[PDB]
């Protein structure tokens, strides 16, 4: 249900796309707010992080954000 620029496969997201994803997720999932620059990297890099890495970058929402990314990956072939 993403901002239109994010409807691509995540491996194609820019660093700014990742930031917009965080902003969208915080509102969509009622998350504790994080710096939208928390993951200073593009989508290809984001896909190399493990769930533990996500929790380290965001203790309050990293587990959710990781599973959200997984859920998004179920969308496109």
From Swiss-Prot:
Involvement in disorder: A chromosomal aberration involving ETV6 is found in a form of chronic myelomonocytic leukemia (CMML). Translocation t(5;12)(q33;p13) with PDGFRB. It is characterized by abnormal clonal myeloid proliferation and by progression to acute myelogenous leukemia (AML). Chromosomal aberrations involving ETV6 are found in acute myeloid leukemia (AML). Translocation t(12;22)(p13;q11) with MN1. Translocation t(4;12)(q12;p13) with CHIC2.
Q: Where in the cell is it found?
A: Nucleus
Domain named PNT: residues: 1-76
Indicate the annotated site residue(s) for Breakpoint for translocation to form PAX5-ETV6: 7-8
What exactly does this protein do? Transcriptional repressor; binds to the DNA sequence 5'-CCGGAAGT-3'. Plays a role in hematopoiesis and malignant transformation.
Domain of life from the UniProt record: Eukaryota
Q: What is the lineage of its organism?
A: Eukaryota, Metazoa, Chordata, Craniata, Vertebrata
* Annotated family: Belongs to the ETS family.
Q: Which organism is it from?
A: Homo sapiens (Human)
| Site location (Breakpoint for translocation to form ETV6-MDS2 in MDS) | 6-7
List the range of the whole protein covered here: 49 to 124 of 452
Tissue specificity note:
Ubiquitous.
Quaternary structure (record): Can form homodimers or heterodimers with TEL2 or FLI1. Interacts with L3MBTL1 and HDAC9.
This protein is called what? Transcription factor ETV6
């Amino acid at each position: 249900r993403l901002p239109a620029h994010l409807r691509l496969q995540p491996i194609y997201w820019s660093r700014d796309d990742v930031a917009q994803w965080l902003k969208w997720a915080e509102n969509e999932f009622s998350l504790s707010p994080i710096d939208s620059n928390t993951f200073e990297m593009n989508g290809k890099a984001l896909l190399l992080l493990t769930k533990e890495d996500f929790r380290y970058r965001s203790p309050h929402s990293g587990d959710e954000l990781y599973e959200l990314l997984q859920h998004i990956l179920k969308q496109r072939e």
